[PDB]
Amino acid sequence: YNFNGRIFYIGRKSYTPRTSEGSIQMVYVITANYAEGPNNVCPLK
Amino acid sequence: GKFPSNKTGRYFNHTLVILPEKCGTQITALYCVLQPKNQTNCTGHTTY
Amino acid sequence: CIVVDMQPSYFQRDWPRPINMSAADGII
Ligand SMILES: *[C@@H]1O[C@H](CO)[C@@H](O[C@@H]2O[C@H](CO)[C@@H](O[C@@H]3O[C@H](CO)[C@@H](O)[C@H](O)[C@@H]3O)[C@H](O)[C@H]2NC(C)=O)[C@H](O)[C@H]1NC(C)=O
Ligand SMILES: *[C@@H]1O[C@H](CO)[C@@H](O)[C@H](O)[C@H]1NC(C)=O
Ligand SMILES: *[C@@H]1O[C@H](CO)[C@@H](O)[C@H](O)[C@H]1NC(C)=O
Ligand SMILES: *[C@@H]1O[C@H](CO)[C@@H](O)[C@H](O)[C@H]1NC(C)=O
Q1: Where are the strands (E) in chain C, listed by range?
Q2: Which end of chain B has less neighbouring CB within 10 Å, N or C?
Q3: Given CB atoms, is C21 within the 8 Å cutoff of chain B?
Q4: Which helix H or strand E contains B8, and what residues bound it?
């Protein structure tokens, strides 16, 4: 691949995004930062 | 990357630019794709 | 589009102001 004028040897491999019946299989990564200041983000109670 | 005039200072994807405006009273921040124009001594051709 | 003059020879006067830690100049 010629990106910007430089040679980059790459490789692409596909995969099936969803199951046969039509359910999309997600992956959700959640990173929560506990800092020393006031905690703004809260669950709604 | 490099300009077509073999110079340095071209950014090939989304750039963040910080610009002061209105006699130094407003500070703006644009995150936009910066495309070179094709005019004489204006980032186009072999003369830059 | 606009013809400009580029000449960095006049742009080399130094008047340096180094970082003074005792005043916390660049402390975030
Ligand atoms: C998170 O969101 C859900 C959905 O928006 C909230 O659940 C909803 O809670 C209200 C009141 O607690 C329910 O209203 C009630 O509905 C029944 C009929 O369904 C009606 O007879 C009552 O008079 C009242 O209006 C609503 O149905 C319910 N919805 C669902 C889908 O459960 C939930 O309270 C939220 N969590 C919070 C705010 O902490
Ligand atoms: C960067 O710019 C190139 C120019 O066409 C474009 O193909 C590429 O998708 C851009 N990068 C991203 C992450 O979109
Ligand atoms: C920029 O100007 C200085 C001043 O003469 C010079 O020493 C330097 O080589 C120049 N750099 C480029 C990339 O033209
Ligand atoms: C740093 O600032 C303090 C406060 O004026 C001064 O006393 C000290 O000499 C400064 N240090 C240097 C290296 O300039």
Answers
A1: none
A2: N
A3: no
A4: none
